[PDB]
Each structure stands twice: as C-alpha cells, then as structure tokens.
Amino acid sequence: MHKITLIPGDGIGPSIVDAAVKVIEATGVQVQWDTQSAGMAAVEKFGTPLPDATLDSIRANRICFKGPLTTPVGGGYRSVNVTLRQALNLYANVRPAISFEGTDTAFSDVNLVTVRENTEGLYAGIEHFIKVDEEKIAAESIAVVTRKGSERIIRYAFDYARRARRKKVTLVHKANILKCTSGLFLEIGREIAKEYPDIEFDDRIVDACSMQMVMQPQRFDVLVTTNLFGDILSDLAAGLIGGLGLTAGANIGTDAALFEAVHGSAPDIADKGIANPTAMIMAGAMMLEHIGEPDAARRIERAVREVIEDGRSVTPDLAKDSPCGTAQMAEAIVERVRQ
Amino acid sequence: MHKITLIPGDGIGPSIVDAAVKVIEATGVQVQWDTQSAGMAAVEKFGTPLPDATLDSIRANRICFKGPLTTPVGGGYRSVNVTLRQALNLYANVRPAISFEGTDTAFSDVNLVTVRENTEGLYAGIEHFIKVDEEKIAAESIAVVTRKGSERIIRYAFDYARRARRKKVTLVHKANILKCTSGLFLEIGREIAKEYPDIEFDDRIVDACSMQMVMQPQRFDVLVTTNLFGDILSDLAAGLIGGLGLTAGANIGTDAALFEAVHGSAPDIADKGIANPTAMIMAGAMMLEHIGEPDAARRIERAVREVIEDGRSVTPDLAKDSPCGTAQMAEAIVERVRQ
C-alpha cells in the first residue's frame, strides 16, 4: 500500500534503521521498501555520495526513510542530507521535543516543536577561500535569506500551530547583528503573524533563547527559525529531553517528505550494537502519520513511551547501570506494539 | 592608582554598574573613574551611539568597565559592543562559567571557560539586501575567517589553559557545512595544537556540542570557537549555572581590555530595580585581576558566593522565595567583601 525509499546510511545507521523497519512492520502497515544507497556507504560502493538512482527513487516514491549520513569536515563532498532537502524542496524541518516519562532528566514537562527553515541560510553552499596562488589567507561563507523562503517557513509554523492545537509561535533570530538576513526574516515574521490573530507571536534573539531553553524550556511551544539556528536549538532541546538518541525530524515539502533521526552516524559507537533506536523509530511514527496511518503512528509512540517508562530494556544512553543493546530495545518495542 | 573608562550603558546597565562600582570601592582599590557614554544613552544625549571622546578615553586609559549596550534589531546603528571590540582589537572574549553553590540548578559542578573569537566571523559587518527598486527579494550576510585571526584566538585559548592550569581545549565548529570558514578555523586549530602537547585537544560540531553541554557540562574545560558560536554557547553555559544575571566576560587585546556582563540591557525589567548585579560585579572582579589586584578580585568573588549561598538577600532571578532588589544584594555583597 506504501512504496517508500529506504536509505540505511552510515555508522549506526543500518542497525537503527533495521530496528525501525521491524517496529513499523509490527504495526501491520504494508510497506514496499525501495532500498537505495547514500552517503559514505555510497562513496565506498559506487564512488559517489548520491547515486542518481537514489534521487530518482525518491522523486518517484515521494516518501523516504533515511538513516544518518556522514558528512566530511573541512573538505570532501557537501552534505547529502542538505542536497536531498534542497533537491526535493523539503523546506520545513519539523523537530518535536516532548518529554518521555522515566528519563533521567532535570525536566519532565518539555513540549516544544522546532520548525527549521531547511533549504537556505548558511546551508546555501556558498563559500570560498581568498588565496594568493595556493596560499589561503582568508575564507568567506555566505548566508542567504529569500523573501519567499522566509514566507513559506513562517506560514508553515503558524499552520502547524493551528493543526496541532498549539498556542504560540516564537521566531528566533539574530537581527541585531545580522541586520539584513535575520532582520528580513524577523520583519516577514511580524508581517505574517497578523494573518494568524488566533496564535500568539513573539521573537527572541538566539543567544538569550538558548539560555532560556536551558533554564525553563516550558516557555516554548512552536519555535520557528533559520537553518543553522534550528540545527543548534533542536540539538539543545534533544539534550533537554534525554539525548539525540530520542529525537526525530520530518523534512516536509509540498510534493515529498523525508523522515530521519536528528542525530548523526555516531562513529564513536558504530558497530558496538548499543545505539538507541528510539529516534529512528519516532521518525517512523512521524512518517506513518504523514502518509495517512495515524493509528499505527500512535501505537508506535505509545510502545516507545511504555518501554522507556518501564526502563528495563533500554540502551546505555538512557539507563547507565543495567542496559541492553539496540536489538533488544527494539524487540521490546515490537512486543509492546503487538500488545 | 588606576584610571578606568566607565560606561553605565542602557536599560539595567546604570543600576548594576552602580552596584559594581560600590563593591569595587569596598575592596579599597584606588580607581579614578572616567565616565563616558555609549549605546542608546549616547544616542539620546549626544545624537551618536559612540562619541569620539568615549573611544579616545578608552584608548588613553586602556581599561574599560562597560554596562550592557542596546543594539537595535533589523536596522539602526551597528552594535557598539562589536565596534568597541574591533576598534580596540580586543580579539579574545573570555567567559568563565563556574557553578555557584546554592543555585536552583540541575548541575553544581560546572567549571568551563569559553574563549570566543571577538573580531570577525559573522560579526564582520558585511551584509546586503538584494532589491529591485525598493522591494527586498533576498538578503545576504558574509562570515569572514582570516588565518591570523584564527591563529591568535586559538593560541590565546591554549596559553590561557596553561596559565590557568586547565587541561583540555575543545575547538567548536561547523566544518562539515561551513567547509571554508569553519574548516580553516579547525585546520589551523589542529596545527596549533601540536605546539601544546601538554594540553589535551579535541573538536566538536556545534550542535552535538550544545547537546553535550546540556547533558554533561563537566566534560568541558576550555572551549575555543568563532564569534557567533561563542555567543550562543556562552549563553547556554550561563543558563547552566543559573542565568545571565551571574556571568561575566573579558574582552582582551594586546594593548587594552574591556570588562562587562554577558547579558544585555534587559528592557523587560529596566527601571524595576530587580536586576541581578552579580554578573557586573564578577566583571569587576575579572577587571581587578587583570590590572594587578588579584586579592581584591578574590575577595569580591568570595563575597558574591557567600551572599548567593546564604540566599536571603538575592534578586528574584535566583529565588522568588524571599526576594529583594538590586540595591539589597549589592549592600549584602559590600558587607561581605568588607569582612
């Protein structure tokens, strides 16, 4: 009933994606998986980080379930995650951070959603060295903000607030220093907020906002922000609710959608069989909800929450004393899905 | 003994700076204050955000004590804080975050120092709109990284780690996406680390680093990073130890130094008399240490810690339990300094 492109990815990717596929299949939803390669795995196998066939598959299916993809630091290929977002026009990156009962966290009542502009800003891919012959004397990177990109991400945030019965959108910016890019984003946000008098609207400078998230994250409902600030703030929120092992993100465009964990390929624990699969499984729930399987999505989320509240078959990031591994935690979630 | 340029600043600035001055004088250190105006106050009084006389005074005295300065969002004058840092070549922004016994915080053992590049990156002041006639269709902002700016900030971080007997420098970057600017910063840091084999060296991508700071700030020692990332991370750290009301920063160049609170002018509580003066007082401590008054600095810090640990004369940001105002807390600290 559903044909979905499946990208196992790099590092801990293949294990957690395996786990998530098992959990999805436990719900009874019918999925034809279209397995494709990307990232470092594809570099190793096909000599390119993004085979044409992978992108063709996503453009045909319109739905993609993607494990984490390694991006090299300081050189090498540009992020395949970013290329995918831009090639498929997945302009909204929606990252819920909602507390899980039972976590060893200072807070237990976090309930926020980050809506991150997903196609431009400091992710435009525009940079250069300033060189004399072969000597690098400086470097520059260009952040790009368009009127039309800002309009769609901010309207997405307000529409989402309505659809989710949330009450407030907070626009996060650095418009005192970045008067042009951040300033244009903020000005457009104030402009669009008047179209949504049912929704409260305020704005915060990103550094004060980070302090406030650490001290009282309960203040936040929907956050809307640009690409890099969204990346940072959503990882902060993940930390608040118990780690990157827990949090998922939906990359939404008008014609396509790609679901993934927020975290990366975790090279420090690759092949050790201990990665928390919760984030990938929650990405599965979000994907199921998007494609019109809300009951299966709710059962997955309830099963994850029950297993984490019980606390006996969870990975070491969640319980340090007597933990199990990726596969055992996933099997516990499969059993709760079936009950 | 010491002639110091004094800038009361904006919003809560004048009250907290007043508090700090009293505490400094309670130590017995001899200060000739050279009062000058900057920021919005100067706009209102002199029609310019940075009178020439203010800059002349700082370049004559080489030491400046500066309350928070308002910067307008989306337009208006460029940050006077940034202009001062750049005009005086104050390339190192040093921000300690060390837990205060008695705070209502998840952690009690945070002990880290952020070393933020203070003159370039996304604070270079290079931006533009893309317009057709008067219609803004897009905007761009340019981050600038130079070889020599990176070299000097990273060497400052290692030298500071040695001088302070700290054991690890962590360089924070986004070099997977910002391959040219962040990538050059990272590459230079790796080269310079080999000049300091006594100092432990690693690197973190900024979003994972934010997650790690909220979950486990004890892993961090000295952080070295670029301008915007340093701003965001140091405010995160301020949150971890109990708020912006507590944390101070030193802007260091070879020929001058400017000491300030990390927080801003706090317009939401300006003129309410409730702002926490701790951050400004700690900025005074850092200033006293810099100008060769370490015992007075240590006495100020001890007095602040005693007053916060006691908890009876503290401002509402620390406890809305039995709260007092700015002037209370300052008098309590003066009395403690003064035994």
Ligand SMILES: NC(=O)c1ccc[n+]([C@@H]2O[C@H](COP(=O)([O-])OP(=O)(O)OC[C@H]3O[C@@H](n4cnc5c(N)ncnc54)[C@H](O)[C@@H]3O)[C@@H](O)[C@H]2O)c1
């Ligand atoms: N969109 C995604 O594909 C994704 C997101 C972020 C990082 N990136 C890529 O991942 C690579 C590694 O980056 P990084 O080390 O800074 O970030 P990371 O997310 O891989 O790791 C950060 C920390 O979280 C831990 N880890 C994250 N997943 C968690 C769970 N599943 N298990 C419990 N611990 C887990 C890691 O062990 C590590 O200590 C980079 O090449 C980066 O480009 C990909």
Ligand SMILES: NC(=O)c1ccc[n+]([C@@H]2O[C@H](COP(=O)([O-])OP(=O)(O)OC[C@H]3O[C@@H](n4cnc5c(N)ncnc54)[C@H](O)[C@@H]3O)[C@@H](O)[C@H]2O)c1
């Ligand atoms: N002077 C510089 O170092 C710099 C520092 C940051 C902000 N700026 C300027 O300050 C203005 C306000 O910015 P903002 O609102 O995002 O940040 P802010 O620091 O002024 O306020 C953030 C929050 O922290 C609280 N506040 C900060 N000072 C603390 C005080 N000592 N104790 C109790 N209240 C605390 C405020 O009430 C507010 O709720 C802006 O114009 C900004 O450019 C000054």
